């Protein structure tokens, strides 16, 4: 009776979170070009569109490879839809499948006559210029083939998050908070007992200094150094207050591939944020469980 | 080397989570005066103060308890510190243990030789003005009492998590909204088959209308019903941009226990948001793996 379609990478991902999450009820049709991303998908229908342009890859985030593939595919789509009376096309706004395919996916659906709902998200504005401007001409190019459509801009994300929260998962979330305070000191000086850092340095920053300030950063991908150092300074606590900081206290934790060169910029990038006799001392911690993302956290003392 | 106090209810809970997650070369010591609540506690060393006072009961979120329980007991805190050079106090300010035994707990352990670090967090301003009061006094009782202290403000704890959000997790987050608003409608409309809403009402709901806003608020506790709702009301998507909305379709979803005037009521406050003339079509679905919590996601359109 329902069918809901994802098209592009960020689309099957949002499916399978339908799908590990116990929802009933529903027909999942999965929909891509990337062929080995389809292979992970968990959805019942797997469709593979435009394997002429592509070869299995991806479609390049080039939106007009991603509506020509889906026309290539006119007839595989039409299939799945038969017997739907209401569809929901959801979709990553931005790329090269999902922006150009997903309006035409829809079309398809509208003119076979079942109620066509676009779900849809535009990308963070930390992506860049062009995917912001991709997603834009899809929303329009969506906008003209739905019956209704659901706009979901990531920049507002963070706020949708803290209405759709509990105060019990909020208080689980202050507690994390407190571990990584706890944590970011405990594993940079008391480290076993091969090489590691001493006390007397650590004495000297935090004895008898009185209020501290807290800051956190992760982040991944190629600049995870520099984008996880910048992320710890603007937090509430820090941003407006590291430049009176007569004492830093820094750990930097980071997967398997963590490089000491990453480690040294980001110190540098916090140490230069900190006043001119600044007390700065940090260290280095391998958690491999993390694959490849960094934590930097930072302490900061003085005032 | 390094001991962690957890001083309270929510710091037990914090110490759990420190457990939980991968930490090594730190002991744990849970301090409570809740007698249940400590047997839940996962750390190794567990002190139950002031059972002359509560009998076992909570302080009762009065701190001059929570100062007095930990007086009554300084000689077993005393044989828990021996040995170490430096510890943490970590507890939530505002309560009646917390609040009163934590700078007691400092005290002891500065005076006993080793660093004393206080990291605590302030309430969230909706829990109360009495409960902001008392944590103020506490966090200035535990400035007078440590070397150094770490406030953590619960109000400014929502970009703590957004700086500490890794990409990755955070389109794990817009998956799970995009989840949320299919499931809002696809739950409410073609629900398998014993009694339910119909089509044509969602049909002239959604029909060539054009844009749509959603939003979503979770809640719990006593007053559940009107803060779910108002909290779905106040989403970034609706807050400014559901008075013009011509037509509503709202879903509310709660556990075992939610009561058939519950749903009457959030949708008497959704409706009153809306447009005169708004054409409000709602149900309810009874999910048994929410304990007491519910969901109320609303989709509006017109325009
Ligand atoms: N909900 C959700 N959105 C995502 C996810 N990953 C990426 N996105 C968003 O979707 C936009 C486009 O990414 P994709 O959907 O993977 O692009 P694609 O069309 O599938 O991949 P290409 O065929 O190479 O163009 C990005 O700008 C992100 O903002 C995800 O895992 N979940
Ligand atoms: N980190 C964290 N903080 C919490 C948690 N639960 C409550 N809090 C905060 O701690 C403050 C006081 O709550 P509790 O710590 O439970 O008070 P308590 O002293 O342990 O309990 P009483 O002995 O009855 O006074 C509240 O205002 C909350 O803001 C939690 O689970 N984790
Ligand atoms: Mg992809
Ligand atoms: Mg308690």
Redesign the interface.
Same mark, same amino acid.
Request: glycine share 8%; proline share 2%.
């Given at each position: 009776?329902?069918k &809901?379609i994802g098209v592009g990478g960020?689309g099957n991902?949002?499916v399978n979170? =339908?799908i590990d999450?116990?929802?009933n009820? &529903?027909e999942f049709i999965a929909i891509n070009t990337d062929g080995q991303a389809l292979n992970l998908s968990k959805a019942e229908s797997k469709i593979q569109i435009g394997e002429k342009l592509t070869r299995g890859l991806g479609a390049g985030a080039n939106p007009e490879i991603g509506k020509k593939a889906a026309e290539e595919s006119r007839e595989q789509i039409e299939d799945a839809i038969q017997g739907a009376? =209401?569809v929901?096309v959801?979709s990553?706004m931005g790329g090269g499948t999902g922006t150009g395919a997903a309006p035409v996916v829809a079309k398809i659906a509208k003119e076979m006559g079942a109620?066509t $709902?676009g779900?849809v998200?535009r990308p963070?504005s930390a992506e860049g210029r062009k995917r912001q401007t991709q997603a834009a001409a899809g929303v329009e190019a969506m906008?003209a083939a739905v019956?209704?459509?659901? $706009?979901?801009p990531?920049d507002?994300?963070?706020?949708?998050?803290?209405?759709?929260?509990? =105060?019990?998962e909020?208080? @689980? #979330? /202050?507690?994390?908070?407190?571990?990584?305070? &706890?944590?970011g000191? *405990?594993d940079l000086? /008391? $480290?076993?007992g091969e090489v590691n850092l001493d006390?007397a340095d $650590? @004495?000297t920053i =935090?004895?008898?200094?009185? *209020? /501290?300030?807290?800051?956190?950063?992760?982040? *991944?991908?190629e600049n995870r150094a520099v984008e996880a150092a910048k992320?710890?300074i603007? *937090?509430?606590?820090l941003e407006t207050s590291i430049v009176g900081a007569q004492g830093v206290l820094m750990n930097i934790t980071g997967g398997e591939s963590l490089s000491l060169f990453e480690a040294q910029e980001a110190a540098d990038i916090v140490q230069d944020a900190a006043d001119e006799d600044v007390n700065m001392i940090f260290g280095t911690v391998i958690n491999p #469980?993390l694959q490849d993302?960094i &934590?930097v956290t930072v302490?900061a003392?003085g005032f």
């Open positions: 009776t329902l &809901v960020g991902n949002a979170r =339908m999450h116990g929802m009820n &529903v009376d =209401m929901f959801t990553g109620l $709902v779900v998200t963070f906008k019956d209704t459509l659901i $706009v979901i990531n507002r994300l963070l706020d949708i998050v803290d209405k759709s929260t509990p =105060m019990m909020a208080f @689980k #979330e /202050a507690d994390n908070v407190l571990r990584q305070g &706890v944590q000191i *405990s000086i /008391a $480290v076993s006390f $650590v @004495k =935090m004895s008898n200094q009185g *209020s /501290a300030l807290m800051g956190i950063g992760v982040s *991944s991908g992320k710890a603007s *937090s509430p606590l #469980e993302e &934590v302490i003392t």
